[PDB]
């Protein structure tokens, strides 16, 4: 098979950051990535603009420099590739990790392509592969999406967005610009505080001009092939509808985490894996986590700017157990 | 059922132009589009730049104005949508025509959503949905694509491009920029003349700096999941290969075209459908074609710049038959 | 000399707008523009982003279409030229009007290039060309600018911005992004309400992170070659300083407006010329005004969006007067 | 009155490269830049696109990374500012060096702000600040420019471009897209080979579609207030003309080079300073040159790509001379 000192699952920004810092401390690493590096950013909507300036998205002392104040999706793609190039990272792409088992102070990794054995393990699988379940009648119709890519094809289509965070407001602005008839249905009373303060004004101006319908305290009750039905303050309303974007968030793959022996916890920030806040070691010895996997659900506690510092934390602890 | 004077199958640029021009002659028309309007352009590679200046893509008295010299893919999308808004065109999107039958002096159109009855029929389906077949061992593996979209995921992958015209050279530049190891295998003796003269220098410079492998007189003989084997002057070579981009062109849906009763016609121009060069009417009375479909095989006869003129021709002939 | 029915001083969007609508009524016009068309937009800062969507900046039967939400400076430049091209407008560029006198029912216009005589006259000279006078010691130093263009050359220079409106806040973000040490000195107590609600948060963040110095209740008292001295509620502070941006607003050339015989007003809200409100005719018979020059009495501002509608009103009144 | 070990005159890319390389070897450096860093690039036409990929513009191990194939002008500005920050280079901006004289183990440098005294001097003044003399009647009219910035204000004006290299060809394209009536007058027989091969096809298409006038073997004889008169193989022609773009090249400031005591000496290829090819030291001990100024006699061209390597070679010779 293959024997590597350390393996990292996930080549997102926090996984990449983990490999660099371990390499800086002389630990030979291998990143195993289900897609290619930073698939998450690759799957952003085409025109997405980050909300961090780009120095705050940079990892391992390769500067992320762009003329705009905030960088776009494709600039991050070009940046993180250069990071891999510059740090000479060993990346196994298009190889999904399917099973991890610990065996006599060693890990046994089974992927869709090979079998590996390693001493240190780092799970940076993030949360984007598992979208929250909608739970209304019709939530499985193919007209329902949990991801937004481009708005052009929904030109002159009656579209509904369920949810109220940055994904919801981003998609509605883009869909309105492309000629969809957009209805946002949000179950809260007022705009979520996590919508970034320099975006909400562009969205709110359009709802005031009767160009987008914004409904608060709205819960969707039924989705058919050509209608959506929602209730507001008890009152049920039914509107014609061609497509539904369920922008209701994501969550980590807990099945995968449990099957390696990692515990769920429920504490200050919700259901999170068990880990040593000071070193990021989990209950399974020599198994670390990095990235938004450490936060759990609340997609506003850990992003790239804080998550990229895990790797350095992991490196100190991994180097320490080298007596 | 549904009764319309005129139906146009295809909401690409040529379909749209045909609708405008018929409407200008007092003909009530309906576009039935399997996707949404200008799906073709919607399915271009993401960062694609047109080779036409943008005055030459403009249709139906809506000026296409951009600050760049040649427009990018997303600008055309914004533009063609506005064309539909301005000209109040009826487009039934996400509705594939499945069957056309002639009965008395009326056509009966069966789609995935309804049945229509019309006097005049205009097939503007273009050729991008039907790719030329590779015809080598391994062409059905999932590592073989006939459409290029974005290059990032092929970062650090060993990629082979089959073909020689603008699709191959566009995709090679984009894949090289994204850090792939690109090998172009072209069955010709020299660069195809139809590659645009302001792109080619960017390709050859990278070729001359040994950044892309370019092979002439090369025919691919086998594709396995991790190799490609091709012949050059009889000599066989086998190189490791992760993905294959078969940029060998596209062709009209001749099955659908025959199933309505239209004759295929062996010309010394490239075997195309039967049509009156002066009116674009087929062998079936009141059934016209417009767009690149009238070119047949070669794709250097009809593009948007001239193909957008069929509409004006067809409208005259339909008006001659009156109503 | 030269004899034209109607003359328009000013080829900004509102001057151009007046010409199109008068021409639509079969009235011959000539635009005399001190620069070339839309010089004002041309003298915007290089990277300036309009605050309107681009349909609200469109004039005269030419759609303003862009893929972004709000268009950039050069997109409007490209656009307003096509408006002139499409409407075949006579424009005499690089010709400043210096002198207007009434004799009979006829005007005699004296420019730096010719002498003109016309029946209808429209003064659409806007306000961007005459900056408010600073009125501090040192305001004549060459280090004092009343216009912002690009920020690069102020890299690692100590810069002061006088003012607190959109010009001041835009210029500060640009200068900070380019590495200047920026101090904004504003004579008010809080952020001006006219700062766009989607821009302010980016500025506010930089102030809170000590990347820009923001001083309220700040009045500048002296500018020397290498210091700036200001008072904050009376206490004097003096800082090292390399350049000064007095973004303290603009005003129409009222000198020119009186020198033809038009009364100003100065009343409560502001200070504007006399005009009929229903025709936009001034106290001088057959003398109209258009554009932001008409702002001042009314408790509203005039941007391109509402100001461009003057032209239509003007055309009717000129159409009533026949001739 | 101020004392530094080494001084570099010129803060363009090759000067900056010199400072980094000297700093890597422990030499105290100071850049004196008449403008701010990379003023030459700052004075490019607003929309200039480099012809180098951006890897080749990188200096001192700060990677220049951009999503597009060739970088634009403002990206080069953003990058070179980040190099100065990243290495912490001392740059005294807006301080023109007027005089250098040799005295003892020291140079005495006179600028418009101070006097310096140093051991090592590196003159990296480039050529973009000194335009070749036009030397025809009218070359001093204000309608004659030796620098191109933006094309919009020349909308619908009669423009003449003198020259035949990329500056002329770039300017013609930018001036044609903005609606000028462009006549390029070149004293040569055919297109200059130095025009980049992916740009020439865009100009040629415009010449062939009679939208730009291109005249070969044309020499300009007179510039009047509103005409230009040129001879083509002796035949005289006179055309109406509003502005003149003398894109006839540039040259290093050779007086300044002589006034320090460095010998210039012309050949084939041109005139260059006298210097050792292995150390880049001039005839004056401890006075080096860097950048395109070293071009002239070598029959080789010096761009940012090759010119940026002087600094390292110069650092060796300076370090060899020890302390
Ligand atoms: C539209 C949008 C905009 C955003 N903007 C910002 C922003 O401006 N700033 C910011 O800080 N954050 C932003 N984020 C959040 C950002 O995406 C995350 O914070 C970041 O990706 C978390 O890092 P990670 O490496 O943990 O996640 P990921 O990038 O998701 O890393 C997980 C990676 O591991 C791979 N993987 C998963 N399971 C397996 C498996 N079993 N085997 C192998 N590989 C596997 C995945 O394919 C993926 O590439 C944004 C998110 C979205 C959706
Ligand atoms: C990468 C790339 C770059 C190009 N650049 C240029 C360029 O710069 N200039 C230029 O002139 N051309 C360019 N082209 C070619 C351009 O796409 C064609 O000229 C043009 O798209 C043909 O227009 P059309 O409407 O005739 O066919 P299409 O554009 O393909 O439109 C046909 C439409 O019919 C729909 N359809 C098909 N079958 C059915 C059915 N049964 N029922 C309903 N709808 C159906 C399809 O979904 C499609 O939307 C480019 C092509 C590619 C691939
Ligand atoms: C940085 C900035 C951003 C802005 N953004 C927006 C925005 O997003 N949306 C918006 O609606 N507005 C915006 N504005 C305001 C906009 O510039 C004005 O509303 C607009 O210019 C009004 O046009 P106008 O035709 O009245 O006059 P102007 O545009 O000022 O044009 C007057 C013209 O007449 C010429 N002229 C003046 N005097 C004479 C004379 N004596 N003889 C001959 N010619 C003369 C001038 O040179 C000029 O070309 C912005 C302004 C600035 C400074
Ligand atoms: C339109 C255009 C496009 C170009 N595109 C490219 C391209 O794609 N790739 C490429 O490699 N090159 C390109 N060039 C050329 C490129 O600008 C030069 O290679 C580059 O400027 C060389 O830099 P340098 O280090 O010699 O110093 P320069 O860039 O020439 O400048 C030296 C500096 O010295 C300063 N200085 C001058 N006199 C004094 C003084 N007395 N005291 C103090 N400071 C002084 C100047 O202000 C200037 O900042 C282009 C040039 C132009 C005009
Ligand atoms: N720089 C950065 O850190 C950065 C940048 C960009 C984006 N982001 C993150 O990306 C997020 C985008 O939103 P998201 O896609 O992740 O959504 P999310 O955070 O999961 O929340 C989606 C919204 O939908 C509602 N919702 C959830 N489940 C629902 C159900 N079953 N039925 C009906 N409504 C439901 C929620 O209401 P409640 O409000 O009641 O929970 C919530 O407001 C932002 O919120 C931000 O956290 C971060
Ligand atoms: N510049 C651009 O942005 C751009 C990009 C892509 C496409 N386009 C336009 O879009 C259209 C289609 O693009 P395209 O370039 O993919 O199609 P194409 O122009 O037909 O290109 C096909 C290429 O593959 C080779 N080939 C054809 N059939 C083959 C087979 N059966 N087996 C192996 N090799 C084969 C051809 O060789 P021969 O040369 O010997 O025929 C040719 O080089 C054209 O109008 C094109 O101009 C423009």
Tokens linked to D119: 């051991």
Residues of chain D with CATH 3.50.50.60: 2-130+250-320, 144-246
**Taking CB atoms and an 8 Å limit, are D82 and A63 in contact across chains?**
yes
Q: Distance between CA atoms of D251 and B100, rounded to whole angstroms?
A: 72
Q: Where are the alpha helices (DSSP H) in chain C?
A: 13-24, 39-42, 73-87, 166-177, 200-208, 254-259, 304-307, 310-320
| DSSP 3-state of A159 | strand
Residue A292: Cβ-neighbour burial (10 angstroms; 0-12, 13-18, 19+): buried
Residues 23-42 of B with CB under 8 A from D: none
**Closest approach of D70 to chain B, Cα-based (Å):** 10
Q: Distance between CA atoms of A310 and A18, rounded to whole angstroms?
A: 7
CA count, 13 A, side-chain hemisphere, B305: 10
How many residues would you count in chain D? 323
- Name which residue sits closest to atom 14 of ligand 1, judged by CA: A303
Contacts 24+ apart (CB under 8 A), D256-261: D256/D97, D256/D123, D256/D125, D257/D123, D257/D289, D257/D293, D259/D99, D259/D100, D260/D100, D260/D101, D260/D102, D260/D121, D260/D123, D260/D284, D260/D287, D261/D102, D261/D287
Residue B87: Cβ-neighbour burial (10 angstroms; 0-12, 13-18, 19+): middle
Determine whether the annotation assigns residue C194 to a binding site: no
- Domain covering B2-130+250-321 in this structure, CATH number: 3.50.50.60
CB C12 near ligand 3, within 6 Å:
yes
Q: Does A173 touch chain C (CB under 8 A)?
A: yes
Measured in Å, residue A180 CA sits from the centre of ligand 5 at 22
The experimental method is X-ray
**Closest approach of C74 to chain B, Cα-based (Å):** 7
At the fourth CATH level, the homologous superfamily of domain B144-246 is FAD/NAD(P)-binding domain (3.50.50.60)
Closest ligand 4 atom, residue D35 Cα: 47
Q: Distance between CA atoms of B49 and D21, rounded to whole angstroms?
A: 40
Whether the Cβ atoms of residue C7 and residue C120 lie closer than 8 Å to each other: yes
Q: Does B206 touch chain A (CB under 8 A)?
A: no
Contacts of A72 in chain D (CB under 8 A): 67
- Judged by its nearest atom, the ligand closest to the C-alpha of residue C259 is 3
Tell which residue, A67, A45, A305, has the closest CA to residue A172.
A45
Contacts of C74 in chain B (CB under 8 A): 67
**Residues 6+ positions from C150 with CB-CB distance below 8 Å:** C45, C46, C47, C174, D42
**Closest approach of D44 to chain B, Cα-based (Å):** 18
Q: Does C75 touch chain B (CB under 8 A)?
A: yes
Residues 180-199 of C with CB under 8 A from A: 196-199
Whether the Cβ atoms of residue C59 and residue C16 lie closer than 8 Å to each other: yes
C232-253 b/e with 16+ CB inside 10 Å = b?
eeeeeeeeebbbbbbbbebbbe
**Taking CB atoms and an 8 Å limit, are A198 and C198 in contact across chains?**
yes
Determine whether the annotation assigns residue C52 to a binding site: yes
Q: Where are the alpha helices (DSSP H) in A68-122?
A: 73-87
Q: Taking CA atoms, what residue in A is nearest to C202?
A: A198
- List residues bridging with C115 in a β-sheet: C110
**Residues 6+ positions from D173 with CB-CB distance below 8 Å:** B69, D199, D202, D203, D206
Tell which residue, B308, B304, B280, B283, has the closest CA to residue B294.
B280
**Least CB-CB distance to C198: which of A69, A177, A201?**
A201
Closest ligand 2 atom, residue B13 Cα: 25
Q: Does B86 touch chain A (CB under 8 A)?
A: no
Q: Are strands B235-240 and B227-232 parallel, antiparallel or unpaired?
A: antiparallel
**Closest approach of D296 to chain B, Cα-based (Å):** 26
Residue B203: Cβ-neighbour burial (10 angstroms; 0-12, 13-18, 19+): buried
Determine whether the annotation assigns residue B79 to a binding site: no
Helix (H) or strand (E) holding B232, with range, is strand B227-232
Residues of chain B with CATH 3.50.50.60: 2-130+250-321, 144-246
Measured in Å, residue B125 CA sits from the centre of ligand 2 at 8
Q: Does A77 touch chain B (CB under 8 A)?
A: yes
Q: Does D201 touch chain B (CB under 8 A)?
A: yes
Tokens linked to D318: 């300076």
From the CB of residue C97, how many other CB atoms can be counted at a distance below 10 Å? Answer: 21
Closest ligand 2 atom, residue B256 Cα: 41
Q: Does B202 touch chain D (CB under 8 A)?
A: yes
Tell which residue, B205, B193, B199, has the closest CA to residue D199.
B199
Instruction: Name the DSSP class of C22.
Output: H
Q: Distance between CA atoms of C251 and C228, rounded to whole angstroms?
A: 25
Q: Distance between CA atoms of B15 and B8, rounded to whole angstroms?
A: 7
Contacts of A197 in chain C (CB under 8 A): 201
**Taking CB atoms and an 8 Å limit, are C199 and A202 in contact across chains?**
no
Residue B58: Cβ-neighbour burial (10 angstroms; 0-12, 13-18, 19+): buried
**Least CB-CB distance to D74: which of A67, A74, A86?**
A67
B255-283 b/e with 16+ CB inside 10 Å = b?
ebbeebebeeeeeeeeebbebeeeebbbe
- Judged by its nearest atom, the ligand closest to the C-alpha of residue D96 is 4
Tell which residue, A49, A94, A109, has the closest CA to residue A76.
A49
**Taking CB atoms and an 8 Å limit, are A66 and D86 in contact across chains?**
no
CA distances from A277 to A273, A288, C100 (A): 11, 11, 79
**Taking CB atoms and an 8 Å limit, are A152 and B85 in contact across chains?**
no
**Closest approach of C88 to chain D, Cα-based (Å):** 12
Q: Distance between CA atoms of D319 and D323, rounded to whole angstroms?
A: 8
- List residues bridging with B39 in a β-sheet: none
Tokens linked to D91: 């740059």
**Residues 6+ positions from C84 with CB-CB distance below 8 Å:** C16, C37, C91, D155, D156
Residue C142: Cβ-neighbour burial (10 angstroms; 0-12, 13-18, 19+): exposed
Sheet containing strand B97-103, strands side by side: B2-3, B115-118, B106-111, B97-103
Instruction: Name the DSSP class of C16.
Output: H
Contacts of B178 in chain A (CB under 8 A): 81
- Judged by its nearest atom, the ligand closest to the C-alpha of residue A128 is 1
- Domain covering D2-130+250-320 in this structure, CATH number: 3.50.50.60
Triad B59, B61, B64: Cα angle to 5°: 60
- Give me the DSSP letters along D107-168: EEEEESS-EEEESEEEE---STTSBPP--SBTTTSTTEES----SGGGTT-EEEEE--SHHH
**Least CB-CB distance to C201: which of A173, A177, A197?**
A197
- Judged by its nearest atom, the ligand closest to the C-alpha of residue B80 is 2
Determine whether the annotation assigns residue B15 to a binding site: yes
- Judged by its nearest atom, the ligand closest to the C-alpha of residue C293 is 3
Measured in Å, residue B170 CA sits from the centre of ligand 2 at 18
**Taking CB atoms and an 8 Å limit, are A179 and B81 in contact across chains?**
yes
**Residues 6+ positions from C282 with CB-CB distance below 8 Å:** C262, C273, C274, C275, C276, C288, C289
Residue C263: Cβ-neighbour burial (10 angstroms; 0-12, 13-18, 19+): exposed
Residues 138-167 of B with CB under 8 A from A: 150, 152-157
Contacts of C37 in chain D (CB under 8 A): 155
CB B42 near ligand 2, within 6 Å:
no
Q: Does C249 touch chain D (CB under 8 A)?
A: no
**Least CB-CB distance to D198: which of B69, B177, B198?**
B198
């Amino acid at each position: 098979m293959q024997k590597v000192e350390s393996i990292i699952i996930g080549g997102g920004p926090c996984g990449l950051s983990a490999a660099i810092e371990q390499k800086r401390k002389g630990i030979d690493t291998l990143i195993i990535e289900k897609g290619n590096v930073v698939e998450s950013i690759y799957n952003y909507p085409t025109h997405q603009t980050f909300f961090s300036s780009s120095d705050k998205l940079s990892i391992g002392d390769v500067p992320f420099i762009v003329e705009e104040s905030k960088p776009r999706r494709n600039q991050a793609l070009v940046y993180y590739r250069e990071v891999v190039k510059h740090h000479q990272l060993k990346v196994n792409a298009f190889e999904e990790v399917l099973t991890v088992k610990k065996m006599n102070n060693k890990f046994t990794i089974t992927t869709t392509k090979d079998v590996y054995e390693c001493r240190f393990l780092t799970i940076a699988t993030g949360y984007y592969g598992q979208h929250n379940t909608l739970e209304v009648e019709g939530a499985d119709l193919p007209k329902v999406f949990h991801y937004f890519k481009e708005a052009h094809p929904y030109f002159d289509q009656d579209v509904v967005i369920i949810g109220g965070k940055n994904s919801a407001i981003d998609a509605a602005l883009e869909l309105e610009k492309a000629g969809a008839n957009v209805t946002v249905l949000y179950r809260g009373g007022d705009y979520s505080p996590s919508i970034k303060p320099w975006i909400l004004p562009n969205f709110t101006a359009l709802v005031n001009h009767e160009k987008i319908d914004m409904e608060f305290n709205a819960n969707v009750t039924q989705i058919t092939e050509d209608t959506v039905t929602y209730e507001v303050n008890g009152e049920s309303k039914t509107i014609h509808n061609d497509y539904v974007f369920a922008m209701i968030g994501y969550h980590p793959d807990y099945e995968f985490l449990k099957s390696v022996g990692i515990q769920i916890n429920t504490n200050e920030f919700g259901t999170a894996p068990m880990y040593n806040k000071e070193t990021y070691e989990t209950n399974i010895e020599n198994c670390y986590i990095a990235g938004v996997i450490a936060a759990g659900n609340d997609a506003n506690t850990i992003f790239i700017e804080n998550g990229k510092f895990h790797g350095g934390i992991i490196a100190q602890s991994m180097l320490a157990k080298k007596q």
